[PDB]
């Protein structure tokens, strides 16, 4: 599945949860992929899309709201956007997802 790869990244790789951390990592160019939930507001989503276009960072649209994405990460709080700095022991970057 796709949630297994995210959980593997959380356990072994490097990641940032939240809009501010993702934007900071995009500004530093330390991001490899950004996962965006379907619940995110349109203005913040468009700003993230423009930032990814500027920084040439891959974008994946999570099929679920922020709390489904949080549960996939393994957290009991809603997360709207995730940035994958390093895949680690997972293979989410290789599979284009």
């Amino acid at each position: 599945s796709i949630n297994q790869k995210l959980a593997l990244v959380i356990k072994s790789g490097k990641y940032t949860l939240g809009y501010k951390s993702t934007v900071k990592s995009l500004r530093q160019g330390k991001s490899k992929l950004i996962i965006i939930a379907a619940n995110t507001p349109v203005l913040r989503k468009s700003e993230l899309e423009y930032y990814a276009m500027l920084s040439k960072t891959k974008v994946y649209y999570f099929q679920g709201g922020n709390n489904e994405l949080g549960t996939a990460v393994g957290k009991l709080f809603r997360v709207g956007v995730v940035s994958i700095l390093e895949a680690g022991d997972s293979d989410i970057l290789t599979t284009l997802a």
Binding site: I2, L33, A52, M53, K56, T57, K58, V59, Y60, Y61, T95, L96, A97
Partner: peptide
């Protein structure tokens, strides 16, 4: 060089 930024699964 970039031609696409939106990602998707490969094996489906």
């Amino acid at each position: 060089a970039i031609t696409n930024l939106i990602s998707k699964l490969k094996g489906q």
